[PDB]
Amino acid sequence: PEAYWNREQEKLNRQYNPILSISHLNYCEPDLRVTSVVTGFNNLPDRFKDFLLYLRCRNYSLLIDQPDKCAKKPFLLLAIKSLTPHFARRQAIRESWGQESNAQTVVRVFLLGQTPPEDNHPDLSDMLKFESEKHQDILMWNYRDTFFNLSLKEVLFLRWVSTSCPDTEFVFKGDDDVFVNTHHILNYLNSLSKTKAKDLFIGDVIHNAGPHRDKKLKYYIPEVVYSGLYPPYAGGGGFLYSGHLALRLYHITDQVHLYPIDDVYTGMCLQKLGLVPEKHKGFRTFDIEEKNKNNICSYVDLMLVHSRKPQEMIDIWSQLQSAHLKC
Numbered sequence: 001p002e003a004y005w006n007r008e009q010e011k012l013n014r015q016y017n018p019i020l021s022i023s024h025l026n027y028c029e030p031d032l033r034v035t036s037v038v039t040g041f042n043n044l045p046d047r048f049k050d051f052l053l054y055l056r057c058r059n060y061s062l063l064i065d066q067p068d069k070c071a072k073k074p075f076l077l078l079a080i081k082s083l084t085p086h087f088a089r090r091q092a093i094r095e096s097w098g099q100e101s102n103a104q105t106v107v108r109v110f111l112l113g114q115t116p117p118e119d120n121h122p123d124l125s126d127m128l129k130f131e132s133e134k135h136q137d138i139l140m141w142n143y144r145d146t147f148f149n150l151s152l153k154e155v156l157f158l159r160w161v162s163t164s165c166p167d168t169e170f171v172f173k174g175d176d177d178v179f180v181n182t183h184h185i186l187n188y189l190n191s192l193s194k195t196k197a198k199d200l201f202i203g204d205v206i207h208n209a210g211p212h213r214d215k216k217l218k219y220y221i222p223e224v225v226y227s228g229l230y231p232p233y234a235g236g237g238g239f240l241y242s243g244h245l246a247l248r249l250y251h252i253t254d255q256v257h258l259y260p261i262d263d264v265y266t267g268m269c270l271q272k273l274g275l276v277p278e279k280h281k282g283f284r285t286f287d288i289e290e291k292n293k294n295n296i297c298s299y300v301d302l303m304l305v306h307s308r309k310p311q312e313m314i315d316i317w318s319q320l321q322s323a324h325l326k327c
């Protein structure tokens with residue numbers, strides 16, 4: 001078409017689809033041709049200019065790995081998107097719904113990029129090494145951890161699954177400011193037939209959405225960048241899928257250009273597999289009703305709630321342990 005991403009994506013489609021008859025994965029120099037191709041490139045916000053220049057570079061390497069995380073074969077892998085300074089959020093997740101267990105082994109990793117000093121981030125590196133050496137649940141890549149780079153966090157994670165955790169039955173991928181009912185999730189996982197557990201992918205799916213064009217909102221996308229409607233995509237606050245689908249998802253990522261909104265990007269990859277994400281009412285990416293926020297019995301049949309502060313996650317998980325004695 002005329003939107004840049006839509007244009008470069010069709011070029012990918014013809015590369016991978018014979019019926020339609022520089023690298024797009026390993027080119028890590030600034031693609032300067034975008035400056036004369038995208039209308040009004042110099043008047044775009046810096047995140048767009050960085051996203052367009054390095055759209056074709058995704059070969060980033062792990063700086064902090066936990067290679068023996070899935071030694072014991074996990075039933076559920078919890079992968080949590082996080083930023084370096086979120087020490088309290090990560091620690092509260094460890095102490096509540098993200099703790100490792102066996103009961104069906106559950107493993108936990110936090111996904112991080114770099115918060116480099118050249119972006120005026122405070123040097124928290126030696127506190128992150130301290131945190132890593134003590135909890136051994138930090139995965140960190142050497143890319144600039146930013147909002148528009150989150151679909152990069154998705155691809156680099158799916159790569160780590162295929163190379164360091166391909167056996168895991170299921171994967172939960174979510175944010176570090178949500179409460180997840182890990183107990184209710186595992187009971188849902190064992191109330192599933194092998195037929196459905198094959199290509200399982202559930203979340204707060206959004207249908208027939210389009211790019212926000214409000215120049216001042218977070219998910220704003222210019223019309224020179226993307227045109228049309230998003231595919232169905234689960235809310236990035238947290239979705240649940242099987243390891244089998246994770247491997248299929250990773251191998252299809254090369255056929256989809258990175259997109260600045262990472263949960264939309266996952267939907268584009270699901271669409272390319274011929275799959276539709278499955279809505280589930282337990283995923284409350286928009287919280288619940290304030291009158292029900294007091295009641296611990298309101299959290300028993302939920303899958304996740306967004307959003308929650310660290311001490312809120314701990315308070316709910318604490319109360320949730322005695323919920324079967326009073327609900």
Ligand SMILES: *[C@@H]1O[C@H](CO)[C@@H](O[C@@H]2O[C@H](CO)[C@@H](O[C@@H]3O[C@H](CO[C@H]4O[C@H](CO)[C@@H](O)[C@H](O)[C@@H]4O)[C@@H](O)[C@H](O[C@H]4O[C@H](CO)[C@@H](O)[C@H](O)[C@@H]4O)[C@@H]3O)[C@H](O)[C@H]2NC(C)=O)[C@H](O)[C@H]1NC(C)=O
Nearest residue numbers: 028029030047048050051054057142143144145146148149
């Ligand atoms: C997602 O994450 C990736 C990975 O971290 C980010 O990619 C990096 O993006 C930064 C820009 O923010 C890149 O750094 C920039 O490189 C430009 C080109 O420099 C190369 O080429 C010149 C010749 O043209 C060589 O001299 C040089 O050795 C480099 O090899 C620079 O022009 C940029 O200049 C910036 O800093 C200097 C010094 O302060 C000043 O001139 C400017 O003020 C300017 O700010 C800058 O250095 C970096 O190369 C990318 N890394 C990789 C591995 O690709 C993405 O930006 C990020 N995406 C989003 C959307 O966040």
Ligand SMILES: CC(=O)N[C@@H]1[C@@H](O)[C@H](O[C@@H]2O[C@H](CO)[C@H](O)[C@H](O[C@@H]3O[C@H](CO)[C@@H](O)[C@H](O)[C@H]3NC(C)=O)[C@H]2O)[C@@H](CO)O[C@H]1O
Nearest residue numbers: 150175206207208209210219235236237261262263285306
């Ligand atoms: C029919 C329709 O138009 N529905 C709209 C929703 O699509 C829209 O949802 C929000 O959209 C954003 C992109 O436009 C984005 O997907 C957002 O999810 C968040 O996305 C970030 C990355 O962009 C991801 O990292 C994060 O995990 C995720 N957060 C949560 C809690 O899921 C999504 O909410 C909505 C705008 O609020 O409006 C609907 O009308």
Ligand SMILES: O=c1ccn([C@@H]2O[C@H](COP(=O)(O)OP(=O)(O)O)[C@@H](O)[C@H]2O)c(=O)[nH]1
Nearest residue numbers: 081082083086145146147150174175176177
């Ligand atoms: O540069 C970033 C910004 C966000 N996040 C994570 O991505 C999730 C979504 O962040 P945010 O809550 O700000 O987006 P929202 O939920 O409001 O859409 C959160 O868990 C953040 O920790 C990240 O990993 N890197």
Ligand SMILES: *[C@@H]1O[C@H](CO)[C@@H](O)[C@H](O)[C@H]1NC(C)=O
Nearest residue numbers: 025026027028057059060061
């Ligand atoms: C990606 O690969 C290219 C070519 O092999 C290389 O020049 C570049 O440095 C790589 N990027 C990273 C981050 O290693």
Ligand SMILES: [Cl-]
Nearest residue numbers: 094100134135
């Ligand atoms: Cl621990």
Ligand SMILES: [Cl-]
Nearest residue numbers: 177308309310
């Ligand atoms: Cl907070």
Ligand SMILES: [Mg+2]
Nearest residue numbers: 175177306307
């Ligand atoms: Mg959030």
